[model samples]
Target chain A: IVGGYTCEENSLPYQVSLNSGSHFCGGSLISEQWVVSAAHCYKTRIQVRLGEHNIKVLEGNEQFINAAKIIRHPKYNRDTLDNDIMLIKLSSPAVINARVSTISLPTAPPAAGTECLISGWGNTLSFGADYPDELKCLDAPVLTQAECKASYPGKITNSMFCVGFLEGGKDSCQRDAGGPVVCNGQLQGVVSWGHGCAWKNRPGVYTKVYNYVDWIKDTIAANS
Target chain B: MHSFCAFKADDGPCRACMKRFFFNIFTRQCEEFCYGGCEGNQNRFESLEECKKMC
Candidate 1:
């Protein structure tokens, strides 16, 4: 998250670190064995770390799991980043504990203007900065698709939604892709793409999870 | 409403509707898997408890 503060340990239990060798991305643990993230963040070799808060520190609660398989949406468009979502299967089920748990996916779309939380280990500053050692979080409001389109114009798709401040102080940045945008205790979106984190009137874009519920269910079913 | 993938018929499914059960070769027992909700075979039970009971 950009212009955000460090998150408390275990405060966001569903958060996961998608380490792709040297670089990493943020993800969310939707189930004991299923992790969700942005398709563009996919790497050939990646490991998932759950119950992790600080990258530099490994506590007893941290669970390092190998990804058995990765499935990105077949229709993910690199140009527009439509359908920019992916699911990762863990080799084994995660041990659910106080510091590790699954987050509930929303059954319906969150109404516009809803206050949501976005957390990740993305860059603190824009323009290819280094990721932080600890997870960071920010509060952003959900914007209506029409309002988001007014800013992006022909770039925003139905599969995506927008979240951020119009004033542009806080937003998700690179490496934040695939993290969770949580509202009302439910997972609503996945960080997909954005224009140089926190730029004025350029809010963060996210994969609208609610729009792909059936696809996710089918994918999980087909893979599991 | 309730079925087990490999467990007994009386057992209940896991709270998560998509979770299914399969026989783990290494463990020699039925275990939870994600149910696609479309093409579950006989091994698929309605609930984890049912799979546990049957397996």
Candidate 2:
């Protein structure tokens, strides 16, 4: 179980522009001043568009914003992927509206079997293709701490969590990086990796959001 | 998109069958169109118009 309905809608808090103008997924807003996403997604200067769905198409319903500063957790290591979560301080507080609002990052983890919510504009099919504009979602059961920990031999750190289809097919794909995986109304994780998109028995791995609560608040307060 | 390029007719009509296009900036003409990928010296041309001159 990774998320909630509100969490799904709030997932695309913004679209990130990469290389020159190519679009890449970054993350969702957790506070007017803080946006949570993945460490690897940080490449060049990141730009965010609040209230937009088709990240590739920037139009009437978008608000362009830039990150004044990007902070990937200091402990992040690509090999082990420890502390894969990061935060961006928007240049200014975003104007919240119906299409754009902040998500809540929980201070604690949810109980097992919590029907979590997951969503993304990630690739529709894993074989070949880009991210689809239609926002898709589905429910995943909150896996037991032990069960999840056991699934990924050495990948699940205290700072990571897991969720996905045990039978496979429903999953977070390429464009879902930096997006949220929530449960019980709280943001539980940041969608990260899996063996391959929707591979059977290989549930998705995510950056455990709650494990870094203090770091999030501390980073934002100090940076802002 | 199809991006196109211009190659010199003298350089042998660009092997006729390739599909994705690359334009010659100098000549403003279709240079080489290939699928799967291109090969050899990568032929960098001057202006868009100058490049198109060959195609």
Candidate 3:
């Protein structure tokens, strides 16, 4: 996150780090065994770590779990980035406690212009130089549907939304892909893509969570 | 014989007014159409890329 602050330890219990070896993308705990993330983050090997503060160090409160299954949206498209959401089923359920908890899913998309909180692992600078050791986040207002389309013509689809300043400065970076966009305590979006980190007229586009609420619940229930 | 692109583009019969895509017979490609809350023709697609993917 650019122009952001390091999140307090355990302040974001639902936020989790997704890694094969190191922090690559970010995810959130939506249930005891399910972590929501971006479909594009799909990899051969994935390890989900919860309650992590400094990724390089073992904070003792962290829970390391192997990903038993990674389920990307059936309709996910790589070229257009459509339906870019996924669910990770942990090999074992995470024990909920002070340092680990689940975030609520949004019943509907947050209204345009609603300020939301996004947390990610790195890219704390505009030039894409810094990678933070601590989790960082910033406040951003949801862009209107029309404005989002205008920012990137023929790109914004029904399943995507944009949030950030039009002039740039503060936004999510590449390392933050598959991160959480929280609004009113509900998981509203999953970091998908953008032109660049904190670029003008290029707000961070996200996979709208409200659109896939059914698929998320159904898939988990059936698998469990 | 009826063709996928031969059908007239429809914005559906609802009032939601969401942006949707449908095959445009005249242009021989997909075009944007204003959609309602529910109901639409087979030409209706959720994304411009999907419209191109199918038609």
Candidate 4:
């Protein structure tokens, strides 16, 4: 996460570390067995680690679960990063505890000016590579669709929104994709993509989770 | 007659500053620049439309 600090331990119980030998992307547990993330992070097989802080350490609070199913949005486009969302059903339901829990989904869309918390384990360096072991988070403000359009022009579509400062400072970055943008105690977005890490007039873009609320519920229900 | 738009941009000698528009001969677009209070060439315009129309 760019311009963010190491989050407090056990603060983000719903956050998932999408690991393939190592943490590659972040996700959020929305249900006992269901995790939401960006479609671009899809791999043949993935191990979802729950309640993680420092990834390198054998944290006693962490829950290692293999993905039983991977569902990428049908309209997901890697080239354009459109509809960039995915669902992962854990092989078994996670054991709920103080260090592991589920997050609620948003019932309504967030306003343009909504303040959201974006959490992930992305690099801290804005223009270079530098990884921190601990999970990081930033308080970001959602931008209007028009303001988002001004930042990315034709790239910002209806299914995507942006959050951060126009002058550049804080934002989600690479390996932060598939992470949760928590707003009002609910999962409202997923870190999708951006121009760079954080540049002037270039805020981080996210998947508009409210638009996919039906798809998420239907996917879980039908699968169950 | 010489075109005012083709003249070099001159903010003049006075230090009292205000933002004004000028017809850029190269870009062929009216752009804003800091204008001085005193004498400046006709390339300076009060409004974008005035610059556009004259250019």
RMSD in angstroms, all models? 17.1, 10.6, 12.4, 16.3
Off by over 4 Å in 4: B1-55
Across A1-224, the per-residue lDDT of candidate 3 in tens digits comes to 88788899889999998886467788999999999998877876799999988988786879999999999999998777889888999999999998899999998787998999999885677653577889898899999988899988998899999998999988887568788999999999998777666878888888899999999989999899
In angstroms, how far off is A162's CA in candidate 1? 0.5
Candidate order by lDDT, decreasing, is 4, 3, 1, 2
Put down candidate 1 lDDT per residue, A1-224, tens digits, no spaces. Answer: 77888998789999998875433577899999999988876766778999988888777669989899898999987666888889999999999998999999898897899999999877677443556889899988999888799878888898988999778878887667788999999999998766557878888888899987888899889988
Q: Which lDDT tens digits does candidate 2 get at residues B1-55?
A: 2233333222110111122334545655554322111132234343445444534
DockQ, Cα level, model 1: 0.01
Candidate whose lDDT is highest: 4
Model 3: per-residue Cα lDDT at residue B37:
22
Weakest 10 consecutive residues, lDDT, candidate 3 chain A? A122-131
lDDT of residue A198 for candidate 4: 78
The reply for model 1, stretches above 4 Å from the true place, is: A127-130, B1-55
lDDT of 2: 0.61
What's the TM-score, to 2 decimals, of chain B in model 4? 0.88
What fraction of correct interface contacts does each candidate retain?
0.00, 0.00, 0.00, 0.00
Residue A207 in candidate 4, Cα distance off native in Å = 0.3
Candidate 1 at A194: error in angstroms?
A: 1.3
Error of 2 at B12 (Å): 41
lDDT of 1 by residue, B1-55 (tens): 1233333311111001134566554566666543312223566655667766666
lDDT for every model?
0.76, 0.61, 0.82, 0.82
Docking class of 4: incorrect
